[PDB]
Design a protein around this ligand. Sequence first.
Ligand SMILES: CC(=O)N[C@@H]1[C@@H](O)[C@H](O[C@@H]2O[C@H](CO)[C@@H](O[C@@H]3O[C@H](CO)[C@@H](O[C@@H]4O[C@H](CO)[C@@H](O)[C@H](O)[C@H]4NC(C)=O)[C@H](O)[C@H]3NC(C)=O)[C@H](O)[C@H]2NC(C)=O)[C@@H](CO)O[C@H]1O
Length: 273
Amino acid sequence: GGIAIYWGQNGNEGTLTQTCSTRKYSYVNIAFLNKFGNGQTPQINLAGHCNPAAGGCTIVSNGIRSCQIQGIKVMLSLGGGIGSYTLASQADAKNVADYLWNNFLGGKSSSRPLGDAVLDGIDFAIAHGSTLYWDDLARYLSAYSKQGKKVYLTAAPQCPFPDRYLGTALNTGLFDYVWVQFYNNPPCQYSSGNINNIINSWNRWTTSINAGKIFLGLPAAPEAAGSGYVPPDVLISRILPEIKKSPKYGGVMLWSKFYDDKNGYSSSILDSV
Ligand SMILES: CC(=O)N[C@@H]1[C@@H](O)[C@H](O[C@@H]2O[C@H](CO)[C@@H](O[C@@H]3O[C@H](CO)[C@@H](O[C@@H]4O[C@H](CO)[C@@H](O)[C@H](O)[C@H]4NC(C)=O)[C@H](O)[C@H]3NC(C)=O)[C@H](O)[C@H]2NC(C)=O)[C@@H](CO)O[C@H]1O
């Protein structure tokens, strides 16, 4: 399979162009659009990379196009660990979908946060807030694909199945790629010497929801998460040999680019994914 990487939450992790030119990632999720819904003005946060206000982040279009020409699919990640992002109603879902279309997809806007580049899709990283209307948002976004260009739909649900926020949305069967987060969740993550919980969790995710492919989400380094880190050798010799048996196996997802560099994770596991 391939590796999906999250980019954008640390200005020292390099440009999007450099990130994709490493030839180690097949998918890149731009994190994050952490503010929207309930009447709020949508706002993107790319840490120290750029300031979105006044088109300060429109330069990212160069990276987006550079990645795409390399066959890499780039999605705008909604949510994240921090943010007042939410959906107050089904109408709110429609408004946000149209916003995303005109500002990040095939629509039109005089203030597209990341430039004129057309992202490949939208990533759902909803970890808190509203538990409703996310399935509506998925449906509305998906409906836009009928205009000519496919709007990819991906999701980063917590490993505890089913996911409290993305369960209904994933039940629609509209998602192409689902990278489950097997960390920051003791019941379904790796523990020194024990891979039972993560494997048992993987079996539940691959034998339920209907999506294109399912990925194994992990922290790129011990510092990347509070818990759940899996040493490269363990992943390679114990975990990958098992999860890769599933026909739905898509590969591995990593948080994040910054921590991948400091730990050299993808460089160690790439070929085994
Ligand atoms: C898919 C998913 O849900 N992923 C989870 C991760 O989100 C989570 O990692 C933590 O994510 C939050 C954002 O959600 C991130 O917060 C960011 O922190 C940086 C560093 O302090 C801030 O960057 C600074 O921004 C200011 C302006 O706002 C700049 O002036 C300054 O230069 C920036 N500094 C740097 C170093 O660039 C961001 O502003 C802030 N983002 C937001 C939206 O507020 C945390 O840092 C992430 N923590 C880690 C360890 O990466 C992860 C945690 O394990 O869990 C995933 O599931």
